[PDB]
Design a protein around this nucleic acid. Sequence first.
RNA 1: GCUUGAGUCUCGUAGAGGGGGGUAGAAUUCCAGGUGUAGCGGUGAAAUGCGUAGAGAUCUGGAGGAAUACCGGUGGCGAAGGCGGCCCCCUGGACGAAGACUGACGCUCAGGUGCGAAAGCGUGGGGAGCAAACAGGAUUAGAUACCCUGGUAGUCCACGCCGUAAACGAUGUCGACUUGGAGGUUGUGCCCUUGAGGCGUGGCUUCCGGAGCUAACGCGUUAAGUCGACCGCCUGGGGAGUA
RNA 2: GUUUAUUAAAAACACAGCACUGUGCAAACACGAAAGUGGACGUAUACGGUGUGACGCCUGCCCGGUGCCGGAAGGUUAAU
Lengths: 271, 100, 88, 55, 117, 51
Amino acid sequence: AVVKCKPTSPGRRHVVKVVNPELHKGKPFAPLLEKNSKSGGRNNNGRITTRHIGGGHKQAYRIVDFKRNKDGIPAVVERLEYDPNRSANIALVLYKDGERRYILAPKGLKAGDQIQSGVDAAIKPGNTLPMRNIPVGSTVHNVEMKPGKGGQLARSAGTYVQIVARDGAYVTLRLRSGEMRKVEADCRATLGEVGNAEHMLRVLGKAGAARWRGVRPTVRGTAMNPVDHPHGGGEGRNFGKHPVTPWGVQTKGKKTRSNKRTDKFIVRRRS
Amino acid sequence: MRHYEIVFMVHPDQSEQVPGMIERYTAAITGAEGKIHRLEDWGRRQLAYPINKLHKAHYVLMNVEAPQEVIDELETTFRFNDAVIRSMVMRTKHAVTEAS
Amino acid sequence: SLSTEATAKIVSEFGRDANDTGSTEVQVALLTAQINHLQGHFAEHKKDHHSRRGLLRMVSQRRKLLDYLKRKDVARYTQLIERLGLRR
Amino acid sequence: EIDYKDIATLKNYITESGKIVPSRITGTRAKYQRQLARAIKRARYLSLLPYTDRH
Amino acid sequence: RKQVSDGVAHIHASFNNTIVTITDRQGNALGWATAGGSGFRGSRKSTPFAAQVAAERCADAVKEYGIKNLEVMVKGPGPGRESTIRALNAAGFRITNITDVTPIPHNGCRPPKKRRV
Amino acid sequence: IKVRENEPFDVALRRFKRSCEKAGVLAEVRRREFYEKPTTERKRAKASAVK
RNA sequence: GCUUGAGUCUCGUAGAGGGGGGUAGAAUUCCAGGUGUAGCGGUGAAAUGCGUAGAGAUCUGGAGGAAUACCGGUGGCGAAGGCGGCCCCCUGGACGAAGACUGACGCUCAGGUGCGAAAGCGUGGGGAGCAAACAGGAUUAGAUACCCUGGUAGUCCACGCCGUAAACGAUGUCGACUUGGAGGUUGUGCCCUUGAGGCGUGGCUUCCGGAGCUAACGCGUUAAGUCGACCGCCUGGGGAGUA
RNA sequence: GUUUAUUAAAAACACAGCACUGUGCAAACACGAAAGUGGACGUAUACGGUGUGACGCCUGCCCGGUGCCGGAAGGUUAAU
């Protein structure tokens, strides 16, 4: 459900909310919360390393189980919750032995819904299981890249990964990027796609909304003096240069991957 | 409680599991107090065209009167079961008992 | 349309006896039964515009019969629409 | 005609390349040409008959 | 070389050109010849004569295999095809089967518009 | 579709394809989806088939 | 009050009627691989295009989308638009057979409301083929075209809008009467069913024709004949279905 | 809303929104002789860079120059 706000007071004219009546209105589960202090974009040297970060609302981190290690024990979904650290929603689940955990919430998953991790799990959305047991051509999220490590691919909302091949000890995966990547087939993955797709349909509406997600303003390069940015100066508007980063490296085209260690695992780059 | 004609092919390599399955399926019909009128096991019969290539397969004709709910779960049983390829369940055409 | 057992039950409830299956209360009650059943069908589907045309024939025909029975015997009208819960 | 499992009968009413024969050829009153064709198609689904002769 | 002794002559007659491919029963091609590659470019590469000289030239260039039996598989319509198989039993082959394997859709893809000539 | 023959054979004589595929069925599927010209081509084909 | 109009009930029949879900087989395109080699494609002829970085042809495996050959028929169903693989679920109507019931409950309909091809529009998907736009090649005096090679929106799905067509039998709806012939399709009754028959009786439909009508052409028991009820519309061409 | 504390508050900066481009996670990128840290306890519906700057109707032609991306045949081409 996306909702256009009525245009009382500009600022509300262009806002589109993504409301969700099935999220838990209340406090989150406490012993899976911890402190998440905000940095400002600044490393252990104090310096701004990533620009444009700072301010925003106070947030508490929620230990989300990306590993999904409790194998063979069923878990009923207790509720769904808002997580501020992610695009997706998190489901609080209760295992049959009395242990609660937060997982990323897949698409169809509601409250009161059986999920089950492990090798002999049924293939239905929410069940984490190794990709040598998942059929080819299935949408799958929360993919591990090394076995035992935790999910790192397809975690952001509305995002899936399709398994396209099972050649040997490896599964070829069409990442959401468009990139075809080989992953070891012992890597767990959760079935379905992660579930807040309508996240991308919200429009924020004013400047302070960006500000309250912690995104300070972006001064564009051509508005500066030449000492500041390579674009700089010039007696009214004046560009005349090939577009670069603030450190002189070409933006608008120039490929910046250099790994050579993980090039074995890339079957085809994105397009 | 209306009539249905179920046929289904079975993978030839699981032909020895055929009568067991039949029993279970028939048992499910008797779970809903529906009755089964004919029942035929047509043997490993040659296919007119290949499917996953897999030639000659094992056919089972059923002809059951039942309520539609157990027929529906019988259809989903035919969906998930990897043994059975090509089910077909049909019309009332009220209860038959003969050969072909 | 409707089940044989259902039609027989409504003829038994609203007629003078069974075989009095064309009386105005009976026709109205059979149309009413089918209208409600198809409320259930058209809450789903919603783009079955052909079946709905059959439904609006049932609504219109019920209306004609209620108008007849209203201008023949009003006591039968009030008992009838009282019993069927129509008219709102 | 009414039945599709009798593929001897159905195989008479089909050409050498799997195609249904018109009632302009075989007689077969139109009701039974319709039952016939529909039975041929139910049989081709079950691989009792072929769809063609180049499978 | 490799001495296959039975093959298939896939002739692909179209309206503009016939292209004859002699292969084995596994489907691996042993040598081909087109009507357009035998001189007579253009309005003359779609004739029965061009198809028969294409088939004569494809009967040559499979001498290294000792083919004696072959099936014939025919695709497409065309001024070729009929003359084509004639040239094959004018080249010492024992012609065993003649199948016509033209692809017919069961109302599949939409064909192109054309030709208000 | 197939033909074969034993050693008494001289000529192709495969007129199985003047029966089904060649003449009409492939030349028909070379050109446009209408719905409209076939309704009138069949209308005048069945209106021409008259004594 | 009454049953000959209208309707209800019982039993069947035929059907691409509608909506939802699933599945199948051919084919096109793409991807990966084997064989193999100099062209392929295209046209009136050509060229652009693809091709020794290995095309086209051919075989194997996979993906995906759309449409559903043959049956197929001046065949069927639907108020009209329209609806074509097969299967299930939900559902509308029609017709027939005998009998029962209600008892004029009927017909038409301005405003009103609904449905309404295609193209188009909005949001979100999908995207194989085809293809407005567009690009290139030709043709030509020119060629913003026809032809060729590509090709995006679109066509496909969900929901909403639009609200029109040579939306046409260019024929409003309902009812009654008025010579015939040959068919098609779907019921039903009777007779040795002595077979793929004989005799009837309904529903829908096609072709030809009689009287009659018509300016003529033609219509002709499905009327454009002979009447009745109600509605819609017309009043010289253009301007203008425009401001 | 912000800005020249102390002659310029503005049409300038910012902005939501749009697009291009990089980035498959030990991410690109940044600070750092390095270790490490930020990006982010995030994972392409995300993150970085660049331009434009609600919304409405739109965004035409040019790839010769400079850049970028891709190609590998041939020419030239360092250390060795």
